[PDB]
Design a protein around this motif. Sequence first.
Motif, PDB file in Angstrom:
ATOM      1  N   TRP A 153      45.106  43.312  23.326  1.00 31.66           N
ATOM      2  CA  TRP A 153      43.946  42.533  23.436  1.00 31.66           C
ATOM      3  C   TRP A 153      43.073  42.954  24.671  1.00 31.66           C
ATOM      4  N   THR A 154      41.697  42.438  24.734  1.00 32.06           N
ATOM      5  CA  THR A 154      40.843  43.068  25.604  1.00 32.06           C
ATOM      6  C   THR A 154      40.325  41.823  26.649  1.00 32.06           C
ATOM      7  N   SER A 155      40.789  42.222  27.836  1.00 36.11           N
ATOM      8  CA  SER A 155      40.320  41.382  28.788  1.00 36.11           C
ATOM      9  C   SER A 155      38.947  41.473  29.169  1.00 36.11           C
ATOM     10  N   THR A 156      38.114  40.552  29.730  1.00 35.00           N
ATOM     11  CA  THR A 156      36.583  40.753  29.814  1.00 35.00           C
ATOM     12  C   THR A 156      36.277  40.960  31.300  1.00 35.00           C
ATOM     13  N   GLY A 157      37.238  41.178  32.271  1.00 31.94           N
ATOM     14  CA  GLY A 157      37.013  41.703  33.319  1.00 31.94           C
ATOM     15  C   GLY A 157      37.735  41.248  34.564  1.00 31.94           C
ATOM     16  N   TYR A 158      37.370  41.336  35.636  1.00 29.37           N
ATOM     17  CA  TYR A 158      38.239  41.134  36.891  1.00 29.37           C
ATOM     18  C   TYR A 158      37.674  40.462  38.107  1.00 29.37           C
ATOM     19  N   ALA A 159      38.033  39.660  38.979  1.00 27.87           N
ATOM     20  CA  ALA A 159      37.756  39.678  40.304  1.00 27.87           C
ATOM     21  C   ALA A 159      38.680  39.819  41.401  1.00 27.87           C
ATOM     22  N   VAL A 160      38.261  40.227  42.666  1.00 24.50           N
ATOM     23  CA  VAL A 160      39.407  40.126  43.665  1.00 24.50           C
ATOM     24  C   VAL A 160      39.055  39.170  44.602  1.00 24.50           C
ATOM     25  N   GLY A 161      40.105  38.396  44.910  1.00 30.00           N
ATOM     26  CA  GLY A 161      39.864  37.173  45.909  1.00 30.00           C
ATOM     27  C   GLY A 161      38.877  36.459  45.566  1.00 30.00           C
ATOM     28  N   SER A 162      38.074  36.179  46.401  1.00 29.97           N
ATOM     29  CA  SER A 162      36.532  35.391  46.208  1.00 29.97           C
ATOM     30  C   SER A 162      35.642  36.194  46.055  1.00 29.97           C
ATOM     31  N   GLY A 163      35.808  37.220  45.581  1.00 32.13           N
ATOM     32  CA  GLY A 163      34.832  38.244  45.208  1.00 32.13           C
ATOM     33  C   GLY A 163      34.140  37.838  43.792  1.00 32.13           C
ATOM     34  N   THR A 164      32.911  38.628  43.670  1.00 37.56           N
ATOM     35  CA  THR A 164      32.266  38.378  42.271  1.00 37.56           C
ATOM     36  C   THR A 164      33.021  38.910  41.423  1.00 37.56           C
ATOM     37  N   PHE A 165      32.836  38.382  40.056  1.00 37.58           N
ATOM     38  CA  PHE A 165      33.593  38.903  38.782  1.00 37.58           C
ATOM     39  C   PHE A 165      32.863  39.989  38.148  1.00 37.58           C
ATOM     40  N   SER A 218      43.921  37.097  45.921  1.00 37.37           N
ATOM     41  CA  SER A 218      44.295  36.840  44.457  1.00 37.37           C
ATOM     42  C   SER A 218      43.424  37.639  43.669  1.00 37.37           C
ATOM     43  N   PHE A 219      43.907  37.767  42.336  1.00 37.75           N
ATOM     44  CA  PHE A 219      43.432  38.504  41.432  1.00 37.75           C
ATOM     45  C   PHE A 219      43.074  37.701  40.203  1.00 37.75           C
ATOM     46  N   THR A 220      41.810  37.903  39.772  1.00 37.50           N
ATOM     47  CA  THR A 220      41.362  37.034  38.500  1.00 37.50           C
ATOM     48  C   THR A 220      41.308  38.010  37.404  1.00 37.50           C
ATOM     49  N   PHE A 221      41.666  37.711  36.313  1.00 36.13           N
ATOM     50  CA  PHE A 221      41.341  38.354  35.002  1.00 36.13           C
ATOM     51  C   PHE A 221      40.727  37.665  33.878  1.00 36.13           C
ATOM     52  N   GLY A 222      39.736  38.071  33.183  1.00 35.09           N
ATOM     53  CA  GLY A 222      39.088  37.383  32.250  1.00 35.09           C
ATOM     54  C   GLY A 222      39.551  37.227  30.709  1.00 35.09           C
ATOM     55  N   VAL A 223      39.445  36.151  30.284  1.00 30.27           N
ATOM     56  CA  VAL A 223      40.036  35.911  28.958  1.00 30.27           C
ATOM     57  C   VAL A 223      38.720  35.154  28.372  1.00 30.27           C
ATOM     58  N   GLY A 224      37.937  35.951  27.538  1.00 22.38           N
ATOM     59  CA  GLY A 224      36.586  35.630  26.880  1.00 22.38           C
ATOM     60  C   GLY A 224      35.823  35.200  28.040  1.00 22.38           C
ATOM     61  N   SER A 225      35.406  33.821  28.345  1.00 21.30           N
ATOM     62  CA  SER A 225      34.689  33.458  29.109  1.00 21.30           C
ATOM     63  C   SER A 225      35.344  32.526  30.232  1.00 21.30           C
ATOM     64  N   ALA A 226      36.702  32.512  29.933  1.00 19.90           N
ATOM     65  CA  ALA A 226      37.746  31.878  30.781  1.00 19.90           C
ATOM     66  C   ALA A 226      38.052  32.889  31.809  1.00 19.90           C
ATOM     67  N   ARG A 227      38.960  32.387  32.905  1.00 22.11           N
ATOM     68  CA  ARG A 227      39.363  33.111  34.012  1.00 22.11           C
ATOM     69  C   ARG A 227      40.812  32.656  34.218  1.00 22.11           C
ATOM     70  N   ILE A 228      41.984  33.749  34.496  1.00 21.45           N
ATOM     71  CA  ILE A 228      43.086  33.307  34.990  1.00 21.45           C
ATOM     72  C   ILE A 228      43.363  33.763  36.479  1.00 21.45           C
ATOM     73  N   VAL A 229      43.650  33.055  37.238  1.00 21.05           N
ATOM     74  CA  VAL A 229      43.790  33.446  38.713  1.00 21.05           C
ATOM     75  C   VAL A 229      45.386  33.499  39.243  1.00 21.05           C
ATOM     76  N   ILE A 230      45.401  34.929  39.640  1.00 20.10           N
ATOM     77  CA  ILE A 230      46.938  35.255  39.637  1.00 20.10           C
ATOM     78  C   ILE A 230      46.840  35.057  41.547  1.00 20.10           C
ATOM     79  N   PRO A 231      47.564  34.116  41.942  1.00 18.84           N
ATOM     80  CA  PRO A 231      47.646  34.029  43.387  1.00 18.84           C
ATOM     81  C   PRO A 231      48.194  35.170  44.147  1.00 18.84           C
ATOM     82  N   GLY A 232      47.929  35.493  45.233  1.00 19.17           N
ATOM     83  CA  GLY A 232      48.101  36.624  46.288  1.00 19.17           C
ATOM     84  C   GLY A 232      49.508  36.806  46.281  1.00 19.17           C
TER      85      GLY A 232
END
Length: 330
Positions: A197-209, A261-275
Motif C-alpha cells: 500500500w502507499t502511505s500518504t506521509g509522516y510527522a515526527v513528534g509534534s512536527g508538521t506533517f 512519537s512518529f505519525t504515518f498517513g493513511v489517506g487523510s487519516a493519521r496513525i500515531v506511534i507513541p515514542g
Amino acid sequence: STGSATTTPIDSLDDAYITPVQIGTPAQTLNLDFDTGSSDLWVFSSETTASEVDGQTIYTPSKSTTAKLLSGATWSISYGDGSSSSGDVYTDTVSVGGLTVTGQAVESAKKVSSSFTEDSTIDGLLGLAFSTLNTVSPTQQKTFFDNAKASLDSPVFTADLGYHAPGTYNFGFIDTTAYTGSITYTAVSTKQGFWEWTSTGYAVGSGTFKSTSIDGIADTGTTLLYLPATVVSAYWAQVSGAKSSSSVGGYVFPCSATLPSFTFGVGSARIVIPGDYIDFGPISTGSSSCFGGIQSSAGIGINIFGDVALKAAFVVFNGATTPTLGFASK
C-alpha cells in the motif's frame, strides 16, 4: 464462519507474537508466528533435524488421523532477515480460534536455520500474504486465509497487536468495539504478493506533517518499521545522541532519551506511534545504548510497516475480490 484468537508477545520487547493453532486429530496445539509478509504455514515437526530443535513444540503427523502426505511436494523459504527453513508437506485439519480448514497444507520442516532453533517460543509460521508467494513445489498451496475465505462471514481478517500486551487476530468479521473513530481504507497492490500500500506521509513528534507517498508492506512478521533513509534520518535527528551505527546494524540512541512519537498517513487519516513503541532496549545486556524501532529500508528494496507501526492501529486485511487495507486508531 468466524475465528478469533489471542496473539501474545514472545518477550518483553514485542520481538514477535505467537498465536495458538490446532493441527491434526486429535489436536496438536502449536504456537505460530502469523506473518502477513509470507505465505507458507510451516511447523517444527517430528521430521525436523534433531539438533535443530531446542524447546519448540513439534507437529507429529503420524499421530494425526487426518494427516496425509502430499506426495512429492517440497518447500523451501528464505526470509528478509536471512533465516530459512525447508521440508516436505502434509495436508491436515487446521483450526485458529474456532475457525477450521480441512485439507490445509502443513509444511513440515526437515531443516531450519539457527535463528529458528534459537527461538524456543516460535513453533512455526502461518503465512497470511497472498498465495502466489507460497513456496510449495511442484503444486503451489493456498494459505489458511485463502482456504477459509469462501466460508467466512466476510472475506477479511484483522490484526490488533498489543504494545507489551496480548492482542487479537480475528477472521471473518470486524470487531467494531476494538478501535476508536473510523477505519480508513486504502488501496493494495498484490503484484509482489504482499499487502502493499502507499502511505500518504509522516510527522515526527509534534512536527508538521510531510505529505509524501511511501510505498510499503503491512507485515506482521517483521518486528520494526523500515522506511526510506530520508524519513528515518528526520526522526532520529530529534533524539539527542542518536546515530546510525554500522557495527550494531542500525540507529541506536541513548537509553536515557525520551523518544518522540512518529505519525504515518493513511489517506487523510493519521496513525500515531507513541515514542515508547520505538524503544527496543539495550543493544546488549547492561548497555546504555538502545536499539531503535524505526530503521532504514535502504538495501531491503521495500519499505516495511512491521509490528512497531501495526501495533499502533487496528488493521483490516480485506481479501475481497479487490483487496484493500484498513487502519483505525485504538
